[PDB]
């Protein structure tokens, strides 16, 4: 319910993590930053997450112009790799199929009984960025094979 106004600073919050060493601290930062919920305003969680898992930041060699040179044109987001792209597509397809399956769970009517569809494999077209992927999703309970 708190609102952000033009009068004061844009500081939403201050997240801190502590660990035995630097790697543990960075892992805790990533874990706590992926599990942090803000809805209503636009935050810079993407920038912090990309900076934390940056290879140069992990190695150590940083400067006061670290943010300026790693993104010359500007911020773009997370350039997810092939495996990460496949994981994201599988997660999205599984979520879509789960919503579709949940849509069919009505209470018993006793006058107009329902006949739940028995779709074995869901064939889906997923458009991400500017690419179309063909996905085959199957469900056997709480497990999805994509």
């Amino acid at each position: 319910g708190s609102d952000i106004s033009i009068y004061y600073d844009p500081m939403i919050s201050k997240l801190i993590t502590y660990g035995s060493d630097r790697t543990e601290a960075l892992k805790r930062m990533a874990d706590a930053l992926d599990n942090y919920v803000i809805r209503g305003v636009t935050h810079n969680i993407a920038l912090l997450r990309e900076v934390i898992i940056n290879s140069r930041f992990v190695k150590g060699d940083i400067s006061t112009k670290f943010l300026s040179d790693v993104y010359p044109d500007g911020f773009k987001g997370h350039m997810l790799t092939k495996s990460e792209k496949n994981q994201l597509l599988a997660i999205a397809s599984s979520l879509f199929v789960a919503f579709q399956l949940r849509a069919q769970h009505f209470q018993e009517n006793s006058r107009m009984p329902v006949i739940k569809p028995d779709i074995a494999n869901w064939e889906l077209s997923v458009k991400l960025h500017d690419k179309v992927h063909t996905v085959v999703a199957s469900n056997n309970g709480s497990v999805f094979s994509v």
Partner: protein, 261 residues
Amino acid sequence: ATSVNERIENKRRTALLGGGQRRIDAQHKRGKLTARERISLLLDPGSFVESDMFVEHRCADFGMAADKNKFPGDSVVTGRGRINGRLVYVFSQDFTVFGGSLSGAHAQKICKIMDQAITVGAPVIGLNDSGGARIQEGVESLAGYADIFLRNVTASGVIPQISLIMGPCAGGAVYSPALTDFTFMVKDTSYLFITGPDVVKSVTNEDVTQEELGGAKTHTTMSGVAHRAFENDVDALCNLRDFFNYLPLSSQDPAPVRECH
């Protein structure tokens, strides 16, 4: 050796295409789908049962008795299906055959499907894309319109009735959606007016386009006739399918209850 068996699939193939492949190509060029693929996109896969596939109009005047004017189905596809496992009765008007004009057989099929729906107690969904009454039929089209209106009024409050206008609907074809519970529209491809712009210009001396006179924006912004407007055909079918889950199948049933997490 009998040709009736061959005639079975002959008329089946002629009915599946409707009024020809050229008109289907024109429909696709207009950015619109045909009735059969609309129904396939609306209902659960492998659940559509069609009724009155071989029904043709009885007109025998003004050259409509010719073999080239006899289309099996007569500009409408009627049947039953299931949405998320729930029974529904659906009809879709075929603009390919005679511009969707409603003949005696068209109204007969609609009345039959509505009667079956009201007997079993299931909702009715109508995809509206039609040019109005067929002049060649004569007063038969008016009788069919009156029968559909009477069934709409009788079924009002008994079973839900949803109408989705997907093309230029003019004349009497605009009163049936108004008698239904909810009216949905497709932007840039659906119209709803009683008289066309030409008649308005000839009578009232005013220049107006079809989109301005009866477009989706006009009926969803400053008229209050339609309830929602959707981007295109596929989005309209998806949103209608989502909306159908909210309503009960009949007034004899309580409000639907789903699973919460």
